[PDB]
Design a protein around this ligand. Structure first.
Ligand SMILES: Cc1ncc(COP(=O)(O)O)c(C=O)c1O
Ligand SMILES: *Cc1c(COP(=O)(O)O)cnc(C)c1O
Lengths: 408, 408
């Protein structure tokens, strides 16, 4: 029984358990083993369910055809992203906010941007996250050697600042009790709570980062579901250009979850403590560690940033916000406290006194509905469950009538 | 100017000057500011130039049309890649070599595979690479914390074993001179040299990884260009499954360079010194730090692994193999030592008593042909130049009459 002499990466061993999502999918592969005929409805992973609009798919199909012509054939392409696409993103999403074409970095998706940022920052930085938050920030940090071990008494990795975002503080932390770090990851609208920060809130966030000499990594993945009058971008806060970057994705807006495109914006005025432009480093990482987003997907996102493309996406965003209103109403009618739902395609449901893993297991077994337990998302966390609103209309109506049968 | 309080990642300051291909791209733009009317032919960056075979692009297109239907809409994940694709890759390139479906991890390409591997390994391993070798292994190693500083005397980074590969050893390390490392990056058919390890050399390498307790990262990106009767996979060497993983790309066979599809194979018996399965850590990385190759790229890759697919790839590999014989004929008829171009789309031309940067500057200046100086690939390296065989036939032909003009 042979073994090499290379030691496992000790940051891999720190990881408490497997990644939240494959584990949920694991738990559900198991349920369809126990019950091969169960009509399983999945509102677990925020996985878009509608076709991509024909305006996007034609662009992609035509790009594929053109690769078989001498004149349409491209090859390797700027790994920063096609220039017309960087421009279109700058203008569409950041026009009037001080961002140029050269500040946008197109990628194969935000999960990949996140880990690209993390290799760039290195393992000598400390980080803060919202609690609860999206598990890829915490997990990438452990992986990169930014942390200590996991403490099972608090449910926290050591050396990470966890910023409690609760129903009682509007899901915004009390920044007077948050310890300085190098990096602050901020998701708005938040996954899993659905909370979108206010102009005044983000104002404080910028001031805080500016006082502590921190970088904010702002995740606007969901910002197109905004209903309230709140910034969609951090760069709307004057002074964000000296302390902030933004990551986003086409997945939620265009349904590109299997299709794969995002970007990150690093402004010319984000500098490390020696004056070295942070953008200059991310560019160096992108050239050595990534090979550029797919040219078919880039033609895709290009067609998105057009009157028709934007119309198409508004429609699909409207469909999901309806599903979410339906989910909100069902749990409200059943007597539960539900947050989120206004500014994001998922709802955040309080089950007081119960473990969220237990709730998840109950709903799954009795209803054949997949949800996501809150403590998948950090210690603040327990016992909320995130219910996602990405399903066909019939599927959400039926999941909803299941939750109705189940609860009193 | 305002500056944050976070320090630059010291692994990025280690790096330097500033990635080779940008460096050549500059000198190419500089050159054209000098010769505005100049007909510049690029035999530089190894980049595919023929259209993707129709049978591929049709598959990719049809996939794109399908994302706009209820039936054929997808969504996320299985970031390991789709089952049928992993199956087809296992069967087609590793049939008979003990490799299961589950050992194959589909990625969006070989540069992103080295990223993910290097993060899985962590900052604490040491690495051996061939000298000259493809920059991505070296630069990614620096980025990850694996080296010390660059030494301008010898032109190498501290803490890397550079395994020299020269005319005098027929471009294979003399392994009894090679110090132990944790990882050995090994590319055959090699880039830049075009040299493909023999069955007896690869057996020597595995036996060396076995006694040193090392991991081989075998790079078969050019394996489909093999002409000599040499193993195309490391897994052809009995015992490789205990000490080797393999990394490949569709970029150089279907011209996927701008489309983006690769894979990495990790056998079941590859373990760390504590008995832990390397593949498991890899699966954890790909799950948390990547979101999968594109569904459209996967559909393309699947169309390749079919009789028509394979027929198409052979015809393109053949086109470029004919380009490369013409390059060899011409340098050889001109008196030089010319290496590779038998098992690879690269010729390795010896220009003794000159620096490769000057031969490059000379060729570029006086013929309007871009090459790649051998020194961009490491000290061993000096002074060859690499000539790529990817371009249109007329372009290769024209560059070749231009070489004759130029030489003695
Ligand atoms: C908070 C958050 N970040 C990132 C992403 C998605 O990124 P990608 O483009 O990898 O799907 C999602 C979805 C998300 O909810
Ligand atoms: C082209 C090439 C690869 C493939 O890179 P992709 O990211 O798939 O394009 C890998 N290794 C070497 C040495 C190469 O030349």
């Amino acid at each position: 029984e042979y073994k090499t002499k290379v030691s496992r990466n000790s940051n891999m061993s720190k990881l408490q358990a497997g990644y939240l999502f494959p584990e949920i999918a694991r738990r559900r592969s198991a349920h369809l083993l126990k019950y091969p005929d169960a009509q399983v409805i999945s509102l677990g992973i925020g996985d878009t369910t509608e076709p991509i609009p024909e305006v996007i798919t034609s662009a992609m199909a035509k790009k594929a055809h053109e690769l078989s012509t001498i004149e349409g054939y491209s090859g390797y392409g700027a790994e920063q992203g096609a220039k017309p696409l960087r421009a279109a993103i700058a203008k569409t999403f950041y026009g009037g906010l001080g961002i140029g074409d050269d500040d946008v970095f197109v990628s194969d998706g935000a999960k990949c941007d996140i880990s690209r940022l993390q290799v760039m920052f290195g393992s000598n930085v400390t980080i803060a996250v919202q609690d609860p938050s999206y598990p890829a920030y915490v997990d990438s940090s452990v992986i990169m050697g930014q942390t200590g071990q996991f403490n099972t008494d608090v449910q926290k990795y050591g050396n990470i600042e966890y910023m409690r975002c609760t129903p009682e503080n509007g899901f915004f932390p009390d920044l007077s009790t948050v310890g300085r770090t190098d990096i602050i990851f901020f998701c708005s609208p938040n996954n899993p709570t659905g909370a979108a920060a206010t102009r005044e809130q983000l104002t404080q966030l910028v001031e805080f980062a500016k006082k502590n000499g921190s970088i904010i990594v702002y995740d606007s993945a969901y910002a197109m579901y905004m209903s309230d009058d709140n910034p969609r971008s951090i760069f709307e806060i004057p002074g964000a250009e000296e302390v902030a970057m933004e990551t986003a994705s086409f997945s939620k807006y265009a349904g590109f979850t299997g299709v794969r495109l995002g970007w990150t914006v690093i402004p010319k005025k984000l500098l490390y403590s020696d004056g070295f432009p942070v953008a200059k480093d991310f560019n160096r990482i992108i050239c050595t560690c990534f090979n550029g987003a797919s040219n078919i997907s880039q033609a895709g996102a290009l067609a998105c940033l057009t009157p028709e493309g934007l119309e198409a996406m508004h429609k699909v965003i409207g469909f999901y916000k309806e599903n979410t209103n339906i989910i909100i109403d069902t749990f409200t009618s059943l007597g539960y406290d539900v947050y989120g739902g206004k500014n994001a395609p998922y709802v955040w449901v309080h089950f007081p006194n119960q473990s969220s893993w237990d709730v998840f297991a109950e709903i799954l077994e009795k209803t054949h509905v997949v949800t996501t337990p809150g403590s998948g998302f950090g210690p603040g966390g327990e016992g909320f469950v995130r219910v996602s609103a990405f399903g066909h209309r019939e599927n959400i109506l039926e999941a909803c009538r299941r939750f109705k049968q189940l609860y009193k």
